[PDB]
């Protein structure tokens, strides 16, 4: 009878996933309070652990910070990271991690679709092979992404490639909308961009993210996290949200995020349309 307080983070994907959770619950007649786009990670995390939120989408790899377990190898594996934060949040905070999306919202490289399809580039390993075969390549990226040891140099080391100076366009202070745009219109001959794994502009501006099978970056997979006492009152909501989040792979999230961020569709309507199309509402 007491309404379920549904939240999310302020960003595009937060708006999308928060509205998805809210509308799934509403379609089952569950009483709700709309607190979508409440704040940043620490604000929503503080809110759910204080009871100001009952459920919101959180990202698996953030378990590294929640449990002071930075540099644990588990966060570099999608399944191991999920299971780890799920176990820890249950026992320590009575927070239940539901089904995670198969997507990984983390740093990667996105390549122009034409170049990716022509050269069969799916993963960062494919990219490395293409480069060592003399493939034409120029990456737009932030100075930070280029220099930080855990960013481009980590990809380079793990996948065995090296970008020369003429294969880089350094853009001072991000952000990925700008680097993606550079590849999209081939600025200074750029054909690839620094991007996040579920970036809306990747879909809208005609790029394709590369996968990270080696697990160089920690995995940030979004999942509903719900207070145990609330799940206790509506146990069925795990079942409701399972096929929904199972369907959210990277390309799907890129398209939905693009609808909102690039083309200015209402996040509420984008969520509603998706749920209706897939037949969950």
UniProtKB/Swiss-Prot annotation:
Biological processes per GO annotation = amino acid transport; amino-acid betaine transport; cellular hyperosmotic response; glycine betaine transport
Q: Which residues form a coiled coil?
A: none
Family recorded in the similarity comment: Belongs to the OsmX family.
Task: Quote the function comment for this protein.
Answer: Part of an ABC transporter complex involved in low-affinity glycine betaine uptake. Binds glycine betaine with low affinity.
Subunit comment:
The complex is composed of two ATP-binding proteins (YehX), two transmembrane proteins (YehW and YehY) and a solute-binding protein (YehZ).
**Molecular function terms in GO for this entry?**
transmembrane transporter activity
Compartments reported by the entry: Periplasm
Which keywords has UniProt assigned to this entry?
Amino-acid transport, Periplasm, Signal, Transport
What is the primary gene name for this protein? yehZ
Q: What is this protein called?
A: Glycine betaine-binding protein YehZ
| InterPro entries, A to Z | ABC_Gly_betaine_transp_sub-bd
Major location, coarse class? Answer: periplasm
Q: What factors induce this protein?
A: Expression is sigma S-dependent. Induced by both osmotic shock and entry into stationary phase.
* GO cellular component labels: ATP-binding cassette (ABC) transporter complex, substrate-binding subunit-containing; membrane; periplasmic space
Q: Does the keyword Electron transport apply?
A: no
SUPFAM superfamilies found in the cross-reference section: Periplasmic binding protein-like II
């Amino acid at each position: 009878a007491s309404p379920v307080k549904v939240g999310s983070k302020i960003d595009t994907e937060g708006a999308l996933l928060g509205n998805i959770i809210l509308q799934v619950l509403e379609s089952h007649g569950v009483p709700t309070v709309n607190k979508v786009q409440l704040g940043t990670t620490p604000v929503v995390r503080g809110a759910i652990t204080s009871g100001e939120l009952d459920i919101y989408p959180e990202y698996t790899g953030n378990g590294a910070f929640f449990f002071k377990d930075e540099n644990d190898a588990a966060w570099k594996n999608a399944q191991q990271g999920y299971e780890k934060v799920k176990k820890l949040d249950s026992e320590h905070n009575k927070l239940i991690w539901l089904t995670p999306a198969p997507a990984n919202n983390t740093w990667t490289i996105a390549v122009r679709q034409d170049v990716a399809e022509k050269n069969k580039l799916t993963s960062l390993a494919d990219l490395s092979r293409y480069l060592q075969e003399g493939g034409t390549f120029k990456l737009a990226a932030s100075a930070e992404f280029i220099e930080r040891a855990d960013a481009l140099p980590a990809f380079e080391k793990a996948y065995g490639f090296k970008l020369g100076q003429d294969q880089l366009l350094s853009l001072a202070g991000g952000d990925t909308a700008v680097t993606i745009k550079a590849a999209a219109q081939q600025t200074s001959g750029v054909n690839a961009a620094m991007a996040y794994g579920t970036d809306g502009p990747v879909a809208a501006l005609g790029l394709q993210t590369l996968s990270d099978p080696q697990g160089v970056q920690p995995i940030y997979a979004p999942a509903p996290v719900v207070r145990e006492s609330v799940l206790r009152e509506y146990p069925q909501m795990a079942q409701w949200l399972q096929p929904v989040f199972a369907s959210l792979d990277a390309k799907t999230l890129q398209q939905l995020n693009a609808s909102i961020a690039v083309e200015g569709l209402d996040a509420k309507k984008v969520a509603a349309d998706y749920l209706k199309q897939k037949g969950w509402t």
